[PDB]
Amino acid sequence: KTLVHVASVEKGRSYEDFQKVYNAIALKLREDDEYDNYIGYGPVLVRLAWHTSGTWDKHDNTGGSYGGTYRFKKEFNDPSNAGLQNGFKFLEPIHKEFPWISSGDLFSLGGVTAVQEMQGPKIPWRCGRVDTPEDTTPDNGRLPDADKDADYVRTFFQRLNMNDREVVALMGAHALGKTHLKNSGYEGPWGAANNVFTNEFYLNLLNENWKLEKNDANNEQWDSKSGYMMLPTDYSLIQDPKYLSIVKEYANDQDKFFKDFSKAFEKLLENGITFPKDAPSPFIFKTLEEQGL
Numbered sequence: 001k002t003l004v005h006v007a008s009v010e011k012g013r014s015y016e017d018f019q020k021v022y023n024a025i026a027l028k029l030r031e032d033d034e035y036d037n038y039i040g041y042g043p044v045l046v047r048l049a050w051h052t053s054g055t056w057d058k059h060d061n062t063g064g065s066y067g068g069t070y071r072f073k074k075e076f077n078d079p080s081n082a083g084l085q086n087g088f089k090f091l092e093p094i095h096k097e098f099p100w101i102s103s104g105d106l107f108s109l110g111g112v113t114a115v116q117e118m119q120g121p122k123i124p125w126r127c128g129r130v131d132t133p134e135d136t137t138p139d140n141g142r143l144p145d146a147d148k149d150a151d152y153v154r155t156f157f158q159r160l161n162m163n164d165r166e167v168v169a170l171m172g173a174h175a176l177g178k179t180h181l182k183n184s185g186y187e188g189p190w191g192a193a194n195n196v197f198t199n200e201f202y203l204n205l206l207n208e209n210w211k212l213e214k215n216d217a218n219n220e221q222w223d224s225k226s227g228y229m230m231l232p233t234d235y236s237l238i239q240d241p242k243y244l245s246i247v248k249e250y251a252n253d254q255d256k257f258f259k260d261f262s263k264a265f266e267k268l269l270e271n272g273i274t275f276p277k278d279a280p281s282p283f284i285f286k287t288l289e290e291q292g293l
């Protein structure tokens with residue numbers, strides 16, 4: 001409702017063009033493997049895709065992935081986005097090689113490419129985000145706090161038009177990467193396989209022995225002897241009986257998690273965008289592995 005953003009295909013471009021951009025991102029992911037103590041850039045690219053999309057407000061269609069507004073300093077410097085500059089830096093050479101792609105298309109495609117190259121589910125992706133000017137940049141404060149409970153999380157995500165299943169599925173991306181004390185006031189990875197996309201987050205929530213501890217920034221987080229952590233908002237998925245049932249489902253069905261994540265992540269990346277009836281169908285990009293590259 002209200003403000004309309006219509007997808008407009010980059011002039012003359014088709015699937016092959018975007019597969020080339022995919023491929024450049026995927027090749028750089030392989031090449032720059034030392035980043036973040038050899039975690040690689042996969043996780044921060046997923047997080048960049050989510051934070052550039054996750055500013056959306058369903059009530060008035062402000063924020064969202066369409067405008068590519070993270071490139072403007074208000075949004076780049078959001079405290080909630082601390083760390084994502086690494087993601088943007090990664091994508092700079094990609095954008096220089098492919099200057100025709102929009103910023104919103106690039107940031108969201110970065111996330112799809114990362115998930116797929118990390119052996120996650122295919123994520124259909126649509127082009128046609130259009131850069132919007134600096135004054136369309138959403139204010140800071142629209143991304144979620146980590147110190148809260150399930151009621152917060154549920155209410156938060158209603159603003160992004162996500163239901164309980166979509167919320168728990170999306171949170172499964174916390175298998176990836178880690179919290180960094182200097183970025184967010186939390187420290188530690190959530191699991192062992194943190195640059196391969198799996199349902200480890202749910203298994204760890206249910207099977208590790210968690211202890212509520214204070215980290216060196218004086219914030220509480222849940223820690224396990226194995227060296228893993230969960231944010232208070234992560235742990236809230238097993239405190240709330242409705243979330244817990246879904247966590248159990250995904251812990252017991254890798255394919256179901258893959259399919260529900262793919263749907264929710266595409267939705268997250270497309271919230272706010274109107275696709276014309278005659279727009280191209282969503283693209284499903286081949287991985288490098290599938291291409292023999």
Ligand code: HEM
Pocket residue numbers: 043044046047050082083144145146147153170171173174176177178179180181183184185186231233
């Ligand atoms: C209640 C919702 C969430 C909160 C409070 C939240 C909080 C966080 C925090 C505090 C960090 C660590 C940032 C850092 O110290 O570098 C993090 C990392 C991350 N988050 Fe979220 N998150 C949530 C939702 C999501 C969702 C929906 C996704 C994507 C689907 C996502 C993907 C990730 C990823 C991939 C990383 C690791 C990034 C890295 O390793 O560089 N998160 N998250």
